[PDB]
Enzyme design. Structure first.
Site, PDB file in Angstrom:
ATOM      1  CG  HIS A  22      -1.857  -1.252   1.163  1.00  0.00           C
ATOM      2  ND1 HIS A  22      -1.428  -2.490   1.595  1.00  0.00           N
ATOM      3  CD2 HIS A  22      -3.116  -1.433   0.694  1.00  0.00           C
ATOM      4  CE1 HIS A  22      -2.384  -3.381   1.391  1.00  0.00           C
ATOM      5  NE2 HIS A  22      -3.419  -2.766   0.844  1.00  0.00           N
ATOM      6  CG  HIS A  29      -4.187  -5.828  -3.051  1.00  0.00           C
ATOM      7  ND1 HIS A  29      -3.844  -4.540  -3.404  1.00  0.00           N
ATOM      8  CD2 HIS A  29      -4.647  -5.757  -1.776  1.00  0.00           C
ATOM      9  CE1 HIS A  29      -4.083  -3.728  -2.388  1.00  0.00           C
ATOM     10  NE2 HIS A  29      -4.569  -4.441  -1.387  1.00  0.00           N
ATOM     11  CB  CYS A  64     -12.274  -4.259   5.435  1.00  0.00           C
ATOM     12  SG  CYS A  64     -11.024  -3.012   5.845  1.00  0.00           S
ATOM     13  CG  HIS A  66      -5.184  -7.291   2.431  1.00  0.00           C
ATOM     14  ND1 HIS A  66      -4.647  -6.446   3.378  1.00  0.00           N
ATOM     15  CD2 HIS A  66      -5.527  -6.508   1.377  1.00  0.00           C
ATOM     16  CE1 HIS A  66      -4.656  -5.206   2.911  1.00  0.00           C
ATOM     17  NE2 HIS A  66      -5.185  -5.217   1.699  1.00  0.00           N
ATOM     18  CD  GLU A  84      -9.028  -5.683  11.701  1.00  0.00           C
ATOM     19  OE1 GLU A  84     -10.047  -4.962  11.812  1.00  0.00           O
ATOM     20  OE2 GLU A  84      -8.407  -5.820  10.619  1.00  0.00           O
ATOM     21  CE1 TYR A 101     -11.174   0.797  -1.574  1.00  0.00           C
ATOM     22  CE2 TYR A 101     -11.782  -1.525  -1.534  1.00  0.00           C
ATOM     23  CZ  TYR A 101     -11.113  -0.444  -0.976  1.00  0.00           C
ATOM     24  OH  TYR A 101     -10.369  -0.609   0.173  1.00  0.00           O
ATOM     25  CD  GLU A 111      -6.188  -1.300   0.395  1.00  0.00           C
ATOM     26  OE1 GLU A 111      -5.953  -1.882   1.477  1.00  0.00           O
ATOM     27  OE2 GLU A 111      -5.992  -1.857  -0.711  1.00  0.00           O
ATOM     28  CD  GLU A 113      -8.361  -3.802  -0.700  1.00  0.00           C
ATOM     29  OE1 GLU A 113      -9.565  -3.577  -0.412  1.00  0.00           O
ATOM     30  OE2 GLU A 113      -7.496  -4.097   0.159  1.00  0.00           O
ATOM     31  CD1 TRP A 158     -14.420  -0.326   3.208  1.00  0.00           C
ATOM     32  CD2 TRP A 158     -12.625   0.908   2.681  1.00  0.00           C
ATOM     33  NE1 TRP A 158     -13.619  -0.263   4.326  1.00  0.00           N
ATOM     34  CE2 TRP A 158     -12.510   0.490   4.030  1.00  0.00           C
ATOM     35  CE3 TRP A 158     -11.610   1.700   2.126  1.00  0.00           C
ATOM     36  CZ2 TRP A 158     -11.414   0.844   4.834  1.00  0.00           C
ATOM     37  CZ3 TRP A 158     -10.520   2.055   2.922  1.00  0.00           C
ATOM     38  CH2 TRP A 158     -10.434   1.623   4.263  1.00  0.00           C
TER      39      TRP A 158
HETATM   40 MN   LIG Z   1      -5.427  -3.705   0.477  1.00  0.00          MN
END
Ligand SMILES: [Mn+2]
Length: 178
Positions: A22, A29, A64, A66, A84, A101, A111, A113, A158
């Protein structure tokens, strides 16, 4: 912890460590996004810690992240909710499968992704991880969507784009219905 790079057609091509992925020119990604509701139906909105590299201190949807190599989107969602939030959830269910987005945070971070969106239910009390989340609110989806329609800039790009998509919204609104 890495990120799975993707080419125009959404086919994996490689792997990049997350912090190094990032930047001001982040490459496409794999990612995911989730909205969690407690037993009672309250939506969980969280605030990203001040130390996050991207959108620090920003209000956004529950969790959110990865997906890693060899990891399904649903197991990724489960892993980050435990990490988290230290919370358990029901099998994550699709809400917005083709969400893609690209956005740019306050210090130029980007970002980029392919972010399939999921919704789930909380089956245990929250155990907030201070390094990832600094604050959270349990509220009525109705209000959240009202805030997003009025002052979008007050939330992650997002979260906005997700709840602005007709289908996703109807799906989020019904989600709590038996
Ligand atoms: Mn990302």
């Amino acid at each position: 912890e890495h990120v799975i790079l993707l080419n125009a057609q959404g086919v994996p091509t490689g792997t990049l460590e997350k912090y190094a992925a990032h930047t001001a020119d982040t490459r496409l990604h794999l990612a995911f996004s989730s909205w969690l509701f407690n037993a009672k139906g309250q939506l969980l909105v969280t605030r990203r810690a001040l130390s996050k590299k991207a959108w620090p201190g920003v209000w956004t949807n529950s969790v959110c992240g990865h997906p890693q190599l060899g990891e399904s989107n649903e197991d990724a969602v489960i892993r980050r909710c435990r990490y988290e939030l230290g919370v358990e959830i029901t099998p994550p269910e699709s809400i917005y499968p083709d969400f893609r987005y690209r956005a740019t945070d306050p210090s130029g971070i980007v970002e980029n992704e392919v972010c399939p969106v999921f919704a789930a239910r909380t089956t245990s009390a929250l155990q907030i991880n201070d390094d990832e989340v600094m604050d959270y609110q349990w509220c009525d989806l109705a209000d959240v969507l009202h805030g997003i329609d009025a002052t979008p800039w007050a939330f992650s790009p997002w979260m906005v784009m997700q709840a602005t998509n007709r289908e996703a919204r109807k799906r989020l609104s019904a989600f709590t219905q038996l």
